Amino acid sequence: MIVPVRCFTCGKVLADKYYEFKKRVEAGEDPGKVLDDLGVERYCCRRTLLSHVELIDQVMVYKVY
Amino acid sequence: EPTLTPDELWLVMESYWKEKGFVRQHLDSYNAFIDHGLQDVVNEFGEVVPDIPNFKVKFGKIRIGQPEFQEAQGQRRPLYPMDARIRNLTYSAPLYLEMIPVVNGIEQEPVEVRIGELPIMLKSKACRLYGLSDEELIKLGEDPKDPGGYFIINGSERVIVSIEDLAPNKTLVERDERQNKVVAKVFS
Amino acid sequence: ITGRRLEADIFIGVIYYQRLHHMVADKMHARSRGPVQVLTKQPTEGRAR
């Protein structure tokens, strides 16, 4: 439900640049160029960043205590 | 004019899926049953004649209330699917039927009594989640993506599976080669 | 292991893979002795019992 800290393949950290990538994608920018500008070269890290779906906000609304 | 591309037909298909949904048959069937099925059953039963001279009870209109549960203490509170699931309760609503007593052939003042509790299909017209937005469903502990269309019985979700039966009151002719006969069957 | 080039060009891609609920943690069952049925004096049925 939250972005993984590291890439599942090579362990490259991607969670720091995920929110900027999501913000730039929603602004109409090309996701490939945004990934290229963020240093995401290998397509495994691109797989991790592109295929992630954020769902933690939909879980926080239900309280468990 | 150029022929339509498959993208436009996909847009129309998506509009159909957005309008009706994916559990439409359950919701439509339950709404039809609630609107006139109970009244049809009551009318087909008609009346009850006990062993009392010159006395009978005539059935009137039947209505369904809001989904609520009566506590063991005595208080009556509205019921929600999450509460029914957690507390192992049945998501049902009371059923009220008007009874008109007939004495010596003259109808008396009708009396409305409770005849039982009928389980309520999720996201149906008789359900408390009908017409609610995503935020309202979230506030009630319900996932907005839940399609509904099922029943909660003693805290367990029960879904009715449709049965692919033959057409009622329809005659079909077939030939049995082994028995060397022609047989037509109807289900009345 | 060897570090040498493979003699054939290996097909590699990205495939959507799903993990199913059939896990070995819920399927491993080992019984030596324990409860038996009252009627038949035979071992019971099920990993839970």
Binding site: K63, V64, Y65 | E71, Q73, R77, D83 | -
Partner: protein
């Protein structure tokens, strides 16, 4: 043998005795579903 519980809906603290409770409900909002709060003691969790 009293204990402190958290309400499921309102979330406020509810204190009652399970042994001698006539009714399990929240006195603030009337909810009959309560949550047992987590103990304040520390626990050790292995990082994978």
């Amino acid at each position: 043998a009293t204990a402190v519980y958290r309400c499921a809906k309102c979330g406020k603290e509810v204190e009652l005795d399970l042994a001698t409770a006539r009714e399990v409900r929240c006195p603030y909002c009337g909810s009959k579903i309560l949550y047992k709060p987590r103990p304040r003691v520390a626990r050790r969790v292995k990082a994978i």
